[PDB]
Every structure is written in structure tokens, then in C-alpha cells.
Amino acid sequence: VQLVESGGGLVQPGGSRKLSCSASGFAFSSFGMHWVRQAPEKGLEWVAYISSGSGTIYYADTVKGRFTISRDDPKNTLFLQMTSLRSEDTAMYYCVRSIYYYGSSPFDFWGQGTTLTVSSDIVMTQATSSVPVTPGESVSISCRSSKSLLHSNGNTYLYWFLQRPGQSPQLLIYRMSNLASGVPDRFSGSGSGTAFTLTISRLEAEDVGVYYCMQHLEYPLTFGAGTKLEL
Amino acid sequence: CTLSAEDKAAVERSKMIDRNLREDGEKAAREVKLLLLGAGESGKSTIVKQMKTGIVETHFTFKDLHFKMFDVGGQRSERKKWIHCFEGVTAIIFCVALSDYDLMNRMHESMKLFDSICNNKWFTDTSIILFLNKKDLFEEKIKKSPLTICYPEYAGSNTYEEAAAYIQCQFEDLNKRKDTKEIYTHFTCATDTKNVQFVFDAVTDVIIKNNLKDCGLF
Amino acid sequence: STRITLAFLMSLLAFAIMLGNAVVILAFVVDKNLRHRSNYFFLNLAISDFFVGVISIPLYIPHTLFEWDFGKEICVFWLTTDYLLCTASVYNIVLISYDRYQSVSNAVSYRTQHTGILKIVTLMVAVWVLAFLVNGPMILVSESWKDEGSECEPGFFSEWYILAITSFLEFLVPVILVAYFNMYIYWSLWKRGHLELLRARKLAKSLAILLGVFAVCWAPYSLFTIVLSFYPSATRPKSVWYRIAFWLQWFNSFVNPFLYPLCHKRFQKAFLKIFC
Amino acid sequence: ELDQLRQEAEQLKNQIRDARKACADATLSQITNNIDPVGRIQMRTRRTLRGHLAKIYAMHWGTDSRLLVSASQDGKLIIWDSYTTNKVHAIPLRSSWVMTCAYAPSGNYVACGGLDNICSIYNLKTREGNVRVSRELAGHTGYLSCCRFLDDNQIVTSSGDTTCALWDIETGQQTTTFTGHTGDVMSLSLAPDTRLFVSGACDASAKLWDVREGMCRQTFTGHESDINAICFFPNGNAFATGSDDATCRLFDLRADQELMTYSHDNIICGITSVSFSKSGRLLLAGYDDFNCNVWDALKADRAGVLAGHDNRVSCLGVTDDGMAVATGSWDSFLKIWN
Amino acid sequence: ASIAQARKLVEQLKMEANIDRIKVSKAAADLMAYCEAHAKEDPLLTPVPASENPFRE
Ligand SMILES: NCCc1c[nH]cn1
């Protein structure tokens, strides 16, 4: 299972570019795909989403109209066509996969990312910016929403991502209190409909990074500000 | 529509699975199904070789028609507990050896098994294709051995003619549902070649008569 | 008086047509197994007869029985829809017969053929378009030929060549096609096939009824209209026998749900499950 | 001399029969004579799961009582979400002849078998978002009739060669073999504590076996034809068997006898599936007459009929929480009743 | 041959004949007590309100 991204570089303003995402090692024909961009110093930001079979396509209002998404199943490739690039489009782009069924784990795998440099929405807020803590202690991170994320079916759509310095974001807890595969049980998460917390019991040297809380209740998907952890 | 994004995506996935299931079913409904039923290795391996574990499946093609043949002679279990799984098969193929009449007699067992299969409550509309075989060695034996061993009540010439016809009529008289069932008898052999054409003609005749029987005619 | 009982008889006939075609349509829409070509053709025939059961007879009853209820624009619409529906039913019968002929002739390509919903929709739309184009435009053009308060008949009923061509294209070609498609089926099985004699007799009998009903219910009225067109007067005053041939064609819409969709042996399963 | 051994075996079985007769002081009906009947049970079809294209032969509820797996001769193994009508998974089988299916208690694995004499185990919770054959257990001589999971590594199967087996999934070898039946074994059920299990065969007799030791603890014989279904009472000290003679019989482990018989004169067809309910008060049994009957377990009366199928009912099951009862028949339709 | 089968059968019968059996009345009473104790947790026996059951058509 791996995703390799191509494109990026330096683009003159008002031009156009194409980004490619090649998936090898899994069934690309049954996974919905997302393009997510991150500013060089700011937090993550959703860009676009394409369903399996290209039935439904969703765009962010920031780049709505001048962006196009597409996919090719026999070649197992995902294409993004960007037109009329402005100075605000510079970013690191990530090609994320997500499969949707009962008990699934969306956003489990993230791509590597490609850099590009140009020469009525739920507000997710993380008041904390940096927490200095020593290894071996328990750390709590608070994320506050602006709407009730709990739904009539009982599910609470809150995702926690950890991005280590120099690495792509990693999924930890996909839905509220649902640990993902491959991570230690020492991570835990809880919430009360509007304000949620992430608890780490025995912090180690590998927990240094930035934590993001994301909502998936309705499009457009909104991220939160970074919450860095320092030794 | 009082649904979340993930629920809508799940509904889309289910709708996509429905299309694949329907497409697979439509493709699988265009194939001809044959059930091979021998009796004590009575030439079963001879005819499966001429068409290009418990159950064996043989898939082949002839004149833009896909034939799937099921051999279930290696089950060695109770037949009544799984025979209903083969209801709806397009046709049944029966192999009878003509050279075991001199060989408890094998011909009587074959007749009993044919009676059991033909007058079964599940195969009340499927047609049986007979494959009376081993004609050459049958003639070789009938030259120096009378047929009266199996049939005491038989007065006929000791030749290939007037003797194989008697066996064919004896096997055909076991039918009791002549109203909706027919038997296609063929005299094949080890060196015979046109068996596949006979199967094709029998199958297309069955298909025509079934299509004209569903519509209310016939 | 006789008007009340006649109106009751017409209402009973319309109700019977309505119920038969509604039952056929309900059976088609309830079950998802009836998604073959023949089932779609039966549905089209049922729709065509159902619309006769709702549009033609109810408007025709007051017009002849009690008092006039038509002016100058309703009559044209009634004539156009009636002719369209009758021709559509005839063409649907021809299409069903042709489908049976294809099933009998080449059964190998019949099974392995993949049509799709688009082709079936195209066939049904073509049937309806051809049903309209025979009578609609000609009636619309010839409506002006009538003089003042002429009775609701197409304006070409005194035109020997136009009426001959219309009757030809509407009845003589379909009956010949049905007769040919109903004799190939019997001859093919007679060539291929005592059980033999009994099955041959259950075919000759079955195919003759389908052709016989179509010929009997559609021949007389087509003959009176052509014969009466030669008289110097505008057609002729209607006798008793002329008003029987008129209603004989509408009786074919009542018979059709009993023959084609009811003996399909897959609609009976739909009928039994829905009712019982 | 075999005649002496046969005579001594006859003496032993006569002694066993006399010992059984000595302990039968009162029937179940006499004790349950004074109790309030359940009354009339009315169940409605909450959901209808469609999408199969052939005869459905088996099904099994999940541990969460929300997901269910169904098997049909179409060649598909479909995992449905039962709350909605969505299809979670659709697995294509290698062999279209399938007669049983199972769902692992953990929810990761699903097993199926049939006329191919091989039990295929698929792993659902994998990477790549795909379902692939995890294991293919072979070694049986007759058709596979049932399969049940003890854990993620051990399975129990029964075949038509008059033999049951306990397999280890990691190494596909028969860890234990249970023999002694003289007819084709058609069903089995595991105890709630997963230490004993009962199996019914075509010799009109059921046998209770010990998993760990591997020897037949007990045998029961009260039927007159082939036994097609079996299931433990929720307590774990009794079980119910259904046969082709239109009768269900409740045997008890401790008393080593049969307690109650459920039958009626209007019903004469065979029985395809039998399952209890939570607390064991009700007993639901499908029949060949296109129906399913609900019997009061303590009494012998009949509570209701679940008549919503147009063909022979082949399987039915009750959730672990008892909220719904699912039925699958020879027509391609699954119906959930509540 | 058949001698081994007869020996296995007689050994199995001998093993089966050595089982202690309780009275039928005690077993029936235990079954009745188990059925009565868990009667309140039977959604099928006692229909639940339309809000409680997840299946609501
Ligand atoms: N061709 C249909 C015209 C008609 C029929 N019956 C009465 N009028």
C-alpha cells in the first residue's frame, strides 16, 4: 500500500498545472479519494473529494470552478487540474484515501505530498497552540467545535490526525472514541457533543508533532489550528 | 435527506454493488447447464474427453453457446440430500454401457438408477439425453453370447440390429412422464466424434420447446 | 329507456377494459422478475388498451346516447387519440408476434442477445410514432374538408384512394405479417417434431385463435368504410350493422388482456402472489 | 464370535433403556400445566433484504446483532447491514454449490462450504479494502453440512461422510475427528461455554460430543427420520431437534431423555431449521410449507405463524439481543420480523 | 473386520451406561425457573415500544 505524487514546482501566476497521484498495493477502484492542501506554515485545509466510480464530486468554495478532479481505474491514477493559479494557491498537496461502509476507517492512509509555489461552515477551533511537556506524563488536547457534531444515528464524526515533523499526517482516532489500527492503545479520545479531548497516558519520544481535529459531519470539511507538542 | 455524508457514501456503495450483482446474474442466466449422471463408470470418462474432490465442472463452447457440465459421480453420499440443488438444470445426460450385459447384473442396476432419476419429483420437466455406448465390443460379445442372459423374455436375431433396439426400447419404456418429458437416444462409441453436435441439437430443441411452452402455446 | 341500459353496457365494457389493463400494469410494476422483452411489450399493449378504456368510450357515450357534448376542438382530439391508441394496440400485437417468431426461428442467438433498456424504449417509442403517423396528420389536414356541422368522422371517409391506403397500411399489412409469423412457428415444429399429433393440435388451435380474433375484430369496419365511400352522398346513414362493426374493434381491447399477458405463465405467478 | 458381542450390546442398551425409564417420574407438560400462556404473537416484516438471484441456503447473524451474512446458490456471499438495507460486502465464491455459512464471533472471518468438500475461510478486516480467501480447509470425503466458530483460530465442521471435525485455522489439519454416526450429519450447534456440542445425523439420532477430549459423551434417539436442525437451549442444559417427520423434540442433558414434542395434524412436511429465542421461552421453526411456526417451549401450544415467503424456508436466526428474527427461503428474499 | 466394530460399539455403550441421571421433574423445574427469571429481557415475547426497537419500517 503506497501512494506516490507527481507535479508541483514553481508556477507563474495565471497559469495552469496538473497533479498526479499513483496508487500501488491496494484496490484503488473501491476507495474514494481526497485532495488536501497545507500552507507552508499554517494548518491543513480540504480541497476536493471524488467518490468511487466518479458518481459524486465535491469541491471547496475557495477553489470551486477553476479546479477539476478525475480518476483512471485501469491505470490506477488520480488527476487534479488546476487553472488560473493565484499567489494564495502555494501549498503542500496530499492524496488521501477513504472507504465508506459500516465500520470503515476513512482517511486511514495519506500520500507523501507534492509542493507547489506560485511566484455557513462549521468552525473547528483549537485554542491551545503549544504545550511543553516531558516524556512519561499524561497530556490532554482540547478541540472545540461550533455545532453539534453528534448525529441522529448516534455517531460523532470527529477525526484526530498526528503529523510528526517531516512526515505526512497519520490517523489516530477516526470517529469519536474509535482507535485506528497500528497505533498503541495509550491514545484515547472522548467528547461531549461540542468539546472533545484527546488523552495520552505515557508520552514517549515519538509523540512530538502537531495534532489536528477534523469534522466530517458535512461538506466542506473543516480543519483546526495546529497544537504543537514540545519536549 | 436526513442522512450524513458517510451514510450517503455507503448508500452509493450499495447501489454500485447492486449493479455488479445484476450484471453477473444476467451473464450467468445465458448459459446452458448439463448434469452428467452415469452408473458405475459406464463410459462417463469417455464423453467428457470428447468435449474439447466431490463435484467436477467442465465449461466449453459450441456454436456461440456456453455449456457447463456437472459431474457428481464422486460424491458417494445420499443422493436425496443434495439432488434438489440441481433443480432447474437445462438437461440431464445419462451414460449406459451396452457391453456389461454379460457382466447382480450391471444392466439392471443401470435401469433402476435411470428409473429413479427419470421419475424424480424434482426433474419433472428436464430432458434426458441417453448415450448408449461401447457398440463395437457389444457386437463382439453378441457374436458369441446371447442377450437372453439379461432378458429371458426376448425372441430376436443375434446381431447388432434387433438387439440394441430392444435395449433402447427397454430403457425408454421406464419413462412415466411422457406428457412433459422427452428422451434423446444416441448410439455413440469410443471413436465417435459427432456427440457434441447431438448434444447441441438436443439442447436447442429443448430451448425452443421451453420458450414456446412458457408463452402459453404448445 | 334503452338509453340507460345501453349506457350501462358501455360503462361495463369500459370498466372491464380498465380493470384488465390496470391488473396487467400492476403485475408488471410489482414484480422485478418480469424484465424481459416480451414483458415490456405486454406492458405497452396494456397501456395502449388502458388509455382506450379511459379516453375513448367515456366521451363517446353521451355524444351518441343522450345529446351532443362535442364542439369543434374536442372532436378532433378524440378522433386523433382513438386512432392513435387503436393503431398502437395493433402494432404492439404485431411486435409480440415478431418476437415469438424470433424466439422460434433462431433460439441460439435469442438467448445470448443483450438488448438493454435503451433498445426496448426505442422499439416502444417507434411503435407509438408509427401508430400516430398513419392517421394523425391526415385527420388534422382533412378536418377542414368537412362542411359546417358534419358528424364526428374523419374528413377523408369520402376519398377512395386515401381511405384505401390508410386501411391497407393500418390493417392489411399487420394481418399478413401476423399470419406469416403464426405459420412459421407451427411448420417449424411440425418439421422438427401420437404425442406428436396431440401437441401439433394444441399448437394449430392456439395460433389460429390469436390470428382469428385479430381478423374478426378488425375486418368488418374496415370493409364498410371503404364500401360506403363510393356513394355520392356523404358516406351513408348508419344502419344497425354499421354500429356493430364500430364497436367490434373496441372489443379487441377487452380480449387482448385475456390472450397475450394472461397465458405467459410468468404473469400468472405475479397474479397469484398479488391477489392470493 | 460377533453374535455374542451383538447380544451383549443388546443387553447393555436394554439396561440403558431401563435406567432411563426409571428416572422418568413426571412429564414436562404436567409441571407446566399451571402457567400463563404467552398468547398470540404477531410479528411484522420490518425489513426486506433483496439482491440474491437464486436459492438461499444459510445465514448467520453477527455478534453485534446488526450485520448478517447470507449464502445462496447464485455464487455470492452477501454481508448486509440489517438496520438499513445496505450491502456491506459481496464475496464471489470459487464454487457455486454452497450449503452453509458462518460468521466469526470477533467479526473478522467468514466461513462457507458445500458440495466441493472444502471449507473456505475469508478474512474481512484486511488492508487494501478487499476480501480474500484466508484459508481452504480440506480433508473431508462428503459434502459439508455445517460449520461453526469457536474463536479466530478453531473451527468445527460436519460432513456427509458420517464424520465431524475440529480444525485449527492456522495449520489446515484436522486437530480432532469425531466418528460414530452411521448417517450423514446434517447440523450441529455449539454450547454457550464452547466445551460441548451436539450433532444430528440421518440415522435419526443425535450425539453430544466433548470438544477437548474428543469422545462422544451421550447419544439420544427419539425421532423417526432424518434430522435437519439442532440448537441448544440458552441455559445450555437442553437442546431441540427438528426432523422430516414434522416433529420437534426437546432433549435434556441431565435427565438424558426427551421432555416435550411439538407437532400438529395440519402440518406434515419436513423441518429445515430450528432456533430458540432469548430466555428460551419461544421456539421458532421453519417448514417446507413456506411458513415458520412459533411454539411455546414450556407448553406444547402454538403461538403464531410467520407466513411471508413464497417458497420453502431454508434458514432462520435470532439475534443475540432478541430484537429481530431473520428468515431466508428458497426464493431469493431475506425477511426480518419484529 | 466386524469384530473391531462390535468391540468399539460395546465399549461405547459401556461408557454411556455409566452416566448419572437426575430426575425429570428437577430438570423441568430448572428450565421453568430459567425461563421465568429472564422473562423481562425478551423483546420478542413482550413487544417493545416503537421508539426502543431499531427496526421501525
Ligand atoms: N381505427 C380506430 C377507429 C375506431 C374504432 N372503433 C371505432 N373507431
Q: Tell me the chain D residues in contact with residue E23 when contact means C-beta distances shorter than 8 Å.
A: 23, 25, 255
The answer to whether residues A124 and A146 touch, using CB atoms and an 8 Å cutoff, is yes
**Best B8, B55, B59 residue to mutate vs chain D (most D CBs within 10 Å):** B55
Distance E11 CA to ligand 1 centre (A): 91
Cβ neighbors of C75 (< 8 A, separation 6 or more) are C152
Distance from the alpha carbon of residue C220 to the mean position of ligand 1, in angstroms = 11
Q: Which of A51, A52, A100, A105 to mutate to test the interface with B (most CBs of B within 10 A)?
A: A100
- Which residue shows C-alpha cell 429371458? B152
Task: State whether residue B74 is helix, strand or coil.
Answer: coil
Pocket lining: C157 vs ligand 1, CB cutoff 6 Å: no
Could you give the dihedral angle defined by the CA atoms of residues B74, B75, B77 and B79, in that order, rounded to the nearest 10 degrees?
-100
Task: Using alpha carbons, select from D257, D201, D227, D228 the residue that is nearest to residue D316.
Answer: D228
How far apart (Å, rounded) are the C-alpha atoms in residues C27 and D271? 32
Distance CA C156, CA B185 (A): 64
Q: How far apart are CA E19 and CA D215, in angstroms?
A: 14
Q: What is the DSSP string of E1-57?
A: -HHHHHHHHHHHHHHHTT-----HHHHHHHHHHHHHHTGGG-TTTSPPPTTTSS---
Residue A143: burial class (beta carbons within 10 Å; 0-12, 13-18, 19+)? buried
Asked if B72's CB is within 8 angstroms of D84's CB, the reply is no
Nearest CA of chain B to the CA of A218: how many Å? 6
Strands (E), D151-281: 154-159, 163-168, 173-179, 185-190, 196-201, 206-210, 216-220, 227-232, 238-243, 248-252, 257-262, 271-276
Partner chains of D (3+ C-beta pairs under 8 Å) = A, B, E
Question: Do the beta carbons of residue C217 and residue C248 sit within 8 Å?
Answer: yes
Say which amino acid occupies C244. Answer: I
3-state SS track over D77-132: EEEEECCCCCEEEEEECCCCCEEEEEECCCCCEEEEEECCCEEEEEECCCHHHCCE
For residue D210, give how far its alpha carbon lies from the nearest alpha carbon of chain E (Å): 13
* Distance between CA atoms of residues D136 and D122, nearest Å: 9
Residue A216, SS3 per DSSP: coil
Domain residue spans of chain E? 3-55
Q: Does the CB atom of residue C38 touch ligand 1 within 6 A?
A: no
What experimental approach yielded this model?
A: cryo-EM
| In chain B, where the domains are located | 3-218
DSSP chain C: -HHHHHHHHHHHHHHHHHHHHHHHHHHHHH-SS--SHHHHHHHHHHHHHHHIIIIIHHHHHHHHHTS----SSHHHHHHHHHHHHHHHHHHHHHHHHHHHHHHHH-HHHHHH----HHHHHHHHHHHHHHHHHHHHHHHHHHGGGS-SS--SS-TTSS-HHHHHHHHIIIIIHHHHHHHHHHHHHHHHHHHH--HHHHHHHHHHHHHHHHHHHHHHHHHHHHHHHHHGGGSSSSS----HHHHHHHHHHHHHHHHHHHHTTTSSSSHHHHHHHHH-
Question: Chains C vs E: touching, with 3+ CB pairs under 8 Å?
Answer: no
B136 annotated as ligand-binding: yes
Instruction: Of A43, A151, A45, A35, give the one whose Cα is nearest residue A98.
Output: A35
Report how many Cβ contacts below 8 Å link chain B to chain D. Answer: 70
**CB contact at 8 A, C225 and C168:** no
Q: Which domains does chain A have, with CATH numbers?
A: 2-118 (2.60.40.10), 130-224 (2.60.40.10)
Cβ of C249 below 6 Å from ligand 1: yes
Give the architecture (CATH level 2) of B3-218: 3-Layer(aba) Sandwich (3.40)
In DSSP terms, A83 is beta-bridged to A16
Dist. CA D170–CA D154, nearest whole Å: 8
Which residues of chain D approach chain A closer than 8 Å at the C-beta? 66-67, 81, 86, 88-89, 127-130
Measured CA to CA, the distance from residue C80 to residue C74 in angstroms comes to 10
- B25 annotated binding-site participant: no
Q: Atom 7 in ligand 1: which residue has the minimum CA distance? A: C246
The alpha-helical segments, DSSP class H, found in B88-194 are 106-118, 135-143, 164-172
Distance CA B15, CA B7 (A): 12
Measured between beta carbons, which residues in chain C are less than 8 angstroms from residue B218?
A: 189, 199, 202-203, 206
Q: Would you state the cell numbers that stand for residue B24, as one nine-digit string? A: 453477473
Q: Judge contact between C166 and C154, C-beta under 8 A.
A: no
Query: Whole-angstrom Cα distance, residue C254 to residue C89?
Result: 11
Domains annotated for chain C, with CATH where assigned, are 2-275 (1.20.1070.10)
C246 lines ligand 1 (CB under 6 A): yes
Whole-number Å distance, alpha carbon C135 to ligand 1 midpoint, is: 11
Q: Which amino acid belongs to residue A38?
A: Q
Write the CA distances from D186 to B32, D177, D325, integer angstroms. Answer: 31, 16, 22
Place of cell 408463452: B215
- Find the CB nearest D117 among B24, B25, B53: B53
Residues C17 and C52: beta-carbon distance below 8 Å: yes
A166 sits in the region (left: phi over 0; alpha: psi -120 to 50; else beta) called left
* In contact, C31 and C270? CB cutoff 8 Å: yes
Q: How far is A102 from chain B (nearest CA, A)?
A: 7
Smallest Cα distance from A95 to chain B, Å: 19
Residue pair A94/A78 in contact (Cβ under 8 Å)? The answer is no
What DSSP character marks residue B133?
A: B
**Interior CA angle at C221 toward C217 and C227, to 5°?**
145
Joined together, the cell numbers standing for residue A11 give 508556477
Q: Are strands D313-318 and D302-305 parallel, antiparallel or unpaired?
A: unpaired
CB C262 within 8 A of CB C268: yes
Closest residue by Cα to residue A227 from A202, A196, A185: A196
**Residue B29 buriedness (CB in 10 A; 0-12 / 13-18 / 19+):** exposed
Give the 3-state secondary structure of residue A189.
strand
Check CB contact of B21 with chain C, cutoff 8 Å.
no
Q: What is the DSSP letter of B99?
A: T
Q: How far apart are CA D69 and CA D328, in angstroms?
A: 11
B6 touches chain A (CB under 8 A): yes
- Give distance in angstroms: CA of C102 to centre of ligand 1: 30
Q: Cell 470425503 maps to which residue?
A: D141
Q: Facing residues of D147 across strands?
A: D157
- Using the Cβ of D33 and the Cβ atoms of chain E, whether some distance falls under 8 Å is answered with no
D300: Cβ contacts below 8 Å, ≥ 6 apart:
D29, D260, D261, D262
C264 contacts on B by Cβ (under 8 Å): 214-216
Contacts of E29 (CB under 8 A, 6+ apart): D31
CA-to-CA distance for D231 and D270, rounded, in angstroms? 17
* B133 marked as part of a ligand binding site: yes
Pairing of strands D216-220, D206-210: antiparallel
Closest D-chain CA to B3? D84
Residue C83 in contact with ligand 1 by CB distance below 6 A? yes
The CA distance from A26 to D131, in Å, is 11
Largest Cα separation within chain A, whole Å, is 51
Paired strand residues for D249 = D241, D261
- CA dist C226 and C234 (Å) reads 12
* Amino acid letter, B113: L
Q: Alpha carbon of B134 to those of B34, B140, C215, D20, D335: distances in Å?
A: 22, 10, 57, 60, 53
Q: Where are the domains of chain D?
A: 1-338
- Most ligand 1 atoms within 8 A of CB, residue of C157, C246, C248, C254 to mutate: C246
Rg (CA), chain B: 22
Distance CA A82, CA A63 (A): 9
Q: Identify all chain A residues contacting B4, using CB atoms and an 8 Å cutoff.
A: 151, 153, 155, 157, 217-218
Pairing of strands D154-159, D144-149: antiparallel
Residue of D nearest to A101 (CA): D88
Cell of C84: 392513435
Q: Which of C45, C1, C59, C32 is nearest to C258 (CA)?
A: C45
| Strand (E) or helix (H) holding A49 | strand A44-50
Say what angle helices C160-167 and C117-142 make with each other, to 10 degrees. 160
- In this complex, do C100 and B215 lie within 8 Å of one another by their Cβ atoms? yes
Is residue B111 within 8 Å of B97, Cβ to Cβ? no
Enter the C-alpha cell of residue A111.
500520500
Q: Give me B43's grid cell.
A: 463410459
DSSP one-letter string for B22-66: HHHHHHHTTSEEEEEE-SSSSSHHHHHTT-----EEEEEESSS-E
Q: CA of D87: which chain A residue's CA is closest?
A: A101
Evaluate whether A38 touches A94 at the Cβ level (below 8 Å): yes
Which helix (H) or strand (E) segment holds residue A45: the answer is strand A44-50
With a 6 Å cutoff on the Cβ, whether C250 touches ligand 1 is yes
Reading across the β-sheet that carries D185-190, which strands appear in turn?
D185-190, D196-201, D206-210, D216-220
Q: Could you give the angle at which helices C195-227 and C240-259 cross, rounded to 10 degrees?
A: 150
Subunit contact D26:E28, Cβ cutoff 8 A: yes
D153 touches D142 (CB < 8 A): no
Task: State which H helix or E strand residue B132 sits in.
Answer: strand B127-132
Domain E3-55 in this protein, CATH class: few secondary structures
Long-range contacts of the stretch B117-122 (C-beta < 8 A, 24+): B117/B37, B117/B92, B118/B174, B118/B175, B118/B176, B118/B177, B118/B181, B118/B183, B119/B174, B119/B175, B119/B176, B119/B177, B120/B83, B122/B83, B122/B84, B122/B86, B122/B87
Closest ligand 1 atom to Cα of C87? 1
Cα separations (Å) of B80 from A199, B54, B129, C53, C162? 62, 16, 21, 53, 70
Of the partner residues E10, E31, E55, the one whose CB lies closest to the CB of residue D238:
E31
Q: For chain E, how many residues are written?
A: 57
D contacts of A26 (beta carbons < 8 Å): 127-130
**Ligand 1: does its nearest atom lie under 6 Å from the Cβ of C84?**
no
For ligand 1, atom 1: residue with the closest CA: C83
Residue of B nearest to A221 (CA): B5
Distance CA D220, CA D258 (A): 8
Cα separation, B138 vs B97, whole angstroms: 9
Residue B110 marked in a binding site: no
Cα–chain center distance at C152:
21
Is B4 labelled a binding residue?
no
Cell of D325: 428474527
**Which of the four CATH numbers 1.10.357.10, 2.130.10.10, 3.30.70.100, 2.30.30.110 does domain D1-338 have?**
2.130.10.10
Per 3-state DSSP, what percentage of chain A is helix, strand, and coil (rounded to 5)?
A: 5, 45, 50
Tell whether E51 is within 8 A of chain D (Cβ). no
3-class secondary-structure state, position A14 = coil
